[PDB]
């Protein structure tokens, strides 16, 4: 049966398996497609890489406002663009 090998995780996957890959300071959502050539598809469209962290859609977090001296609350939206929102709290 057909497999993919991911050199970043070091693991072997079956077609349709989904997993996380650490690459270029980000976490990618990957899927083993195979297609006769161990084809893997990886995306960061559905994650929010803010502040050096990696969040999933619906995650919320807090981060300091640069200069204001208060915190922000942020929410990961994704929208196919790795997009998030922040507001003062």
């Amino acid at each position: 049966e057909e497999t993919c090998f991911d050199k970043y995780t070091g693991n072997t996957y079956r077609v349709g398996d989904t997993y996380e890959r650490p690459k270029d300071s980000m976490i990618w959502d990957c899927t083993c497609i195979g297609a006769g050539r161990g084809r893997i598809s990886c995306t960061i469209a559905n994650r929010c890489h803010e502040g050096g962290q990696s969040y999933k859609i619906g995650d919320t977090w807090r981060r300091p406002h640069e200069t204001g001296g208060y915190m922000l609350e942020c929410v990961c939206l994704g929208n196919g663009k790795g997009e998030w929102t922040c507001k003062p709290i």
Partner: peptide
């Protein structure tokens, strides 16, 4: 720059 939000990889021809 982040020009695209995904990539595709497959086995090298060699």
């Amino acid at each position: 720059s982040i020009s695209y939000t995904d990539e595709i990889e497959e086995e090298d021809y060699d």
